[PDB]
Amino acid sequence: GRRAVRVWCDGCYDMVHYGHSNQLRQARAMGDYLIVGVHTDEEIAKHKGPPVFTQEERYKMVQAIKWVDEVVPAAPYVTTLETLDKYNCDFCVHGNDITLTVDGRDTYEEVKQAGRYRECKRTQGVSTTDLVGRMLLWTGVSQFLQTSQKIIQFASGKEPQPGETVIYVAGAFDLFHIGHVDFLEKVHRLAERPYIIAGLHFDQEVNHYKGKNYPIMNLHERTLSVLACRYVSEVVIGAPYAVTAELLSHFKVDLVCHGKTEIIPDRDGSDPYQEPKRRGIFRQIDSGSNLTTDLIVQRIIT
């Protein structure tokens, strides 16, 4: 009936960003199903420094990316034909980095010789070193070039259907991380057919209430980061800090959630959730995670 083409990727996925997401999207577009091998903390420490995020954090983050069908924990550092056969994958997909042994032989010679290796395009605008750099520091630093096409590639493109519960969440969603995934995952359980709209605050607003040099990622980068998450149906690309009556009617919102993090008051001292609270449609959800963008900055610099 086809047959199905099963695609393999592997990696560390330590500090996942929209570059990793875009690479996984590309890999999935080359077949029908995507399996991602993720290395253990130990295996990574053998080859380079130990990772910032624990293997179980990294596993969970990768599984939350909507193009990924399954995560294989404890994948070997280098892709082999044996691993591809074990998971019945036709080929693996990696970036175009030079990957040579000390001798000048390709790290992936085996897989490449068997014709089971594919390259995907490198993602413009981000890398893990760039993001580290931003964290060691509002007018914006990213050279990401957002386009209608990148949004189309990342967006599910679906409108709310009859029977679907529209649920609005809002925030910075900066350095979109496992705390956000845990939040969104719980929100997604609140209805049988959830349609989650994530409202992303403007860069200048985030800087105002989060301070310092925040946000690390600009509105356009955070747009792609949130759209990659399997729990998200739509994003408001520049949402007001106050959850307004206009927003609630425009999107026909059924429920509004916020996590157990602190809600900073609005410019005028008001509760930015006052309207949905008055309507009786506000629900606080405990994500069970204490991870914040501020604490990631701390784990990554230290």
Ligand X SMILES: Nc1ccn([C@@H]2O[C@H](COP(=O)(O)O)[C@@H](O)[C@H]2O)c(=O)n1
Q: Which residues are annotated as a binding site?
A: 172-173, 180-183, 210, 258-261, 287-291
Least distance to ligand X, CB of residue 175, Å: 9
Distance CA(272)–CA(263), nearest Å, equals 8
Least distance to ligand X, CB of residue 88, Å: 37
Residue whose Cβ sits closest to ligand X: 259
- In this complex, which beta carbon is closest to ligand X, that of residue 91 or of residue 168? 168
292 near ligand X, rule: CB under 6 A: yes
Residue 171's beta-bridge partner residues? 200
21 near ligand X, rule: CB under 6 A: no
Judge contact between 62 and 38, C-beta under 8 A.
yes
218 near ligand X, rule: CB under 6 A: no
287 near ligand X, rule: CB under 6 A: yes
* CA distances in angstroms from 122 to 20, 26, 171, 228, 248, listed in the order given: 9, 10, 29, 17, 38
DSSP strand pairing (6-11 vs 33-38) = parallel
Among the residue ranges 2-10, 81-89, 146-154, 174-182, the one whose residues contact ligand X (CB under 6 A): 174-182
Detail the residues annotated as belonging to a binding site for CTP: 172-173, 180-183, 210, 258-261, 287-291
The tokens for 27 are 């890999």
Closest CA to 168 of 221, 222, 246: 246
The tokens for 167 are 């649920």
Looking at residues 60 to 99 of the shown chain, list those that interact with ligand X (rule: CB under 6 A).
none
Among the residue ranges 2-10, 77-85, 136-144, 164-172, the one whose residues contact ligand X (CB under 6 A): 164-172
289 near ligand X, rule: CB under 6 A: yes
CA-only gyration radius of the chain, Å: 20
Total residues interacting with ligand X, rule: CB under 6 A:
17
Tell which one of 37, 51, 125, 171 touches ligand X (CB under 6 A). Answer: 171
279 C-beta neighbours (distance < 10 Å), count: 14
Report cis status (omega within 30 of 0) of the bond before 134. no
- Interface map 248-267 toward ligand X (x if CB under 6 A): ----------xxxx------
Among the residue ranges 58-66, 77-85, 91-99, 283-291, the one whose residues contact ligand X (CB under 6 A): 283-291
224 near ligand X, rule: CB under 6 A: no
Looking at the chain, list the stretches that DSSP marks H as alpha helix, in order from N- to C-terminal side: 18-29, 41-47, 55-64, 81-86, 109-113, 128-136, 148-154, 178-188, 203-210, 219-227, 245-250, 274-279, 293-301
Least distance to ligand X, CB of residue 261, Å: 4
Q: Could you list the residues that contact ligand X (CB under 6 A)? A: 169, 171-174, 179-180, 183, 258-261, 287, 289-292
